[PDB]
From Swiss-Prot, chains A, B:
Annotated source species: Homo sapiens
Assigned protein family: Belongs to the PDK/BCKDK protein kinase family.
Protein's job: Kinase that plays a key role in the regulation of glucose and fatty acid metabolism and homeostasis via phosphorylation of the pyruvate dehydrogenase subunits PDHA1 and PDHA2. This inhibits pyruvate dehydrogenase activity, and thereby regulates metabolite flux through the tricarboxylic acid cycle, down-regulates aerobic respiration and inhibits the formation of acetyl-coenzyme A from pyruvate. Inhibition of pyruvate dehydrogenase decreases glucose utilization and increases fat metabolism. Mediates cellular responses to insulin.
Name of the gene encoding the protein in the UniProt record: PDK2
Keyword Transferase in annotation: yes
Matching SUPFAM superfamilies: alpha-ketoacid dehydrogenase kinase, N-terminal domain, ATPase domain of HSP90 chaperone/DNA topoisomerase II/histidine kinase
Name this polypeptide is given: [Pyruvate dehydrogenase (acetyl-transferring)] kinase isozyme 2, mitochondrial
Activation/inhibition comment: Activity is enhanced by binding to the pyruvate dehydrogenase subunit DLAT. Inhibited by ADP and pyruvate; these compounds interfere with DLAT binding and thereby inhibit kinase activity. Inhibited by dichloroacetate. Inhibited by AZD7545; this compound interferes with DLAT binding and thereby inhibits kinase activity.
Amino acid sequence: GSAPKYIEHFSKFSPSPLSMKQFLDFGSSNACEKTSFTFLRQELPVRLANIMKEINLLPDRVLSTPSVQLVQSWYVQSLLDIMEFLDKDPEDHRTLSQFTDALVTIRNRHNDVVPTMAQGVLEYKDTYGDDPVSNQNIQYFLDRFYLSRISIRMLINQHTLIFDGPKHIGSIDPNCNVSEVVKDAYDMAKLLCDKYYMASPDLEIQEINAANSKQPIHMVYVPSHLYHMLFELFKNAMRATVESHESSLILPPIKVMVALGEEDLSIKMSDRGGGVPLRKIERLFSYMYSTAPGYGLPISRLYAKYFQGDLQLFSMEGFGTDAVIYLKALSTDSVERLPVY
Amino acid sequence: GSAPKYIEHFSKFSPSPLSMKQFLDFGSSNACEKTSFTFLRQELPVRLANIMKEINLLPDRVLSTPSVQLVQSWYVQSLLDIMEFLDKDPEDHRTLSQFTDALVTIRNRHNDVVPTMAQGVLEYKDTYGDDPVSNQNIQYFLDRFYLSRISIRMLINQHTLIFDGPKHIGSIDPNCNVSEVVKDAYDMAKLLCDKYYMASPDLEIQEINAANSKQPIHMVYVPSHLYHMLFELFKNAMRATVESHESSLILPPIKVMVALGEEDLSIKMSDRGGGVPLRKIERLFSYMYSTAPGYGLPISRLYAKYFQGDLQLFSMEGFGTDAVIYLKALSTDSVERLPVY
Ligand SMILES: N#Cc1c[nH]c2ncccc12
Ligand SMILES: N#Cc1c[nH]c2ncccc12
Ligand SMILES: [Cl-]
Ligand SMILES: [Cl-]
């Protein structure tokens, strides 16, 4: 087979990070399908080969596991699927239609990679232990492997959603109202909270538009990514609030502040769920320490970092916890953050 | 001279970190002066030699500067001063009295090491530049050099303050009321704020004693260290609040929360001084980036880390900033954190 050959070749190239503007240009109209095809048939084999080369450089005890071999098999097949289109003609509509169908198949093939890689982490802990050095190496690899995955699934979604044969550009909303996404994520977390706990904290939202007070806060962003982060934070904050007030009657509300500055758009979620000692904060972001026979926070932080943001937690044991999503306010500063190969 | 010989010998030993309990035992009574002398005449040459060996391993362009040579000369003389007492007899009261006088001299000799090392940083920036690699190496060294200094000045203060010929044990207050220290630091910052700005924010304090509600929060700590941290944070928060509301009439108060948990004692200072973009947070803790022709925060964080605590900043650009001091609530968990040699 030529799979090792392809990996070596395309690993020589560096991934090309795209900005929000570039995403909006690719999706401005259906006339750009050919340009998207020409870009992706080269870029997707590059990004796939770079992360596949890093997988092959893992230690033999990790590389020989069934989880890694299964994931690697799905990365080899996806690579080969894209390679078939390198010599095809963009002017042929059939070539473009087949490319879209191939991307949907590739996306579905990798839909279970996060629980599979979690199974591998649990196997490692039981087979070799949970030492700190192992934690760092696993954290280093999975952060890069999951950020690569996010970037590859972003490109695929933009092509398939737009070139399917407007206000929203695929998964990007150029006028995303942050408060509405906050409400949506709270409402979903509330439904689950009421069902499992028979009680739910209320929600309070306050907006601070520094430059234009009393004007609703909008941004260019991927609302599905923002929902995923806010949903995970709401679930954790509601659980802590309800469980810490089981023997009390008052249930403190969850308070969200949306602040718009000259370059940051910040979203703070404040709860009074008893808080967490500082010693345990790092474990909440660790894949290995959160694994038990709990990746919402570490993956949520990767979504924030994907467009040059961040997600941070600061708690006060005995009182409550604050969780801040830092996003770039300006589309010019919103650029893909890809793993440094 | 035997100075290089002494450094090599005592650098072989590891510093011995002490706990709060051990500090209270050394200072329980004046009868323990002999034990303190026997411990310090060995421990102080160990800690001095370890940081002196690291200084000698700096690159020649840093080591040859007048600032480092001056500091190193003060570390060689202080070492030699302590070496004189190694063969002396602890039972002789004159030996003990002379040791105390020697420690006061050593302490005063090093009183200007923080502005001197700041002069060296400014010289480096102008002579070789402010590249990121230089920033990391300088940050790594100064954090260790300033934490060593804090630990050596703690030992000296405990001996000189107690064995000078109770409620407080030297610089340690076994019943430190945190809120009172907060008020003291605010009052000092307010005086300076009113003098320079003709306006000052008010103060609001709220205590959360999770285990014993409505009971004042006390701890075993060094109130002078806590004051230094709170004073620096108050000065920065007041400056930002006043300057960000110059064209407004309302001046938001600075809100402090003191929370006591099972293992953390947390102090949050919240202001509405307009906040800071996330990109600038790391620069606030950098010695090199805060140097201009501003070490309060980086040194304040070292005071917090000295007894296994921390100091963290999280801001919301366009609104305000939160600054949290994390301390250990229990004296059993309060142990010296020394540089890993
Ligand atoms: N995210 C988040 C959290 C928000 N509050 C929490 N309390 C305990 C543990 C995690 C959390
Ligand atoms: N410490 C601290 C600060 C608290 N608020 C601030 N605003 C701007 C810059 C630094 C700070
Ligand atoms: Cl994947
Ligand atoms: Cl010093």
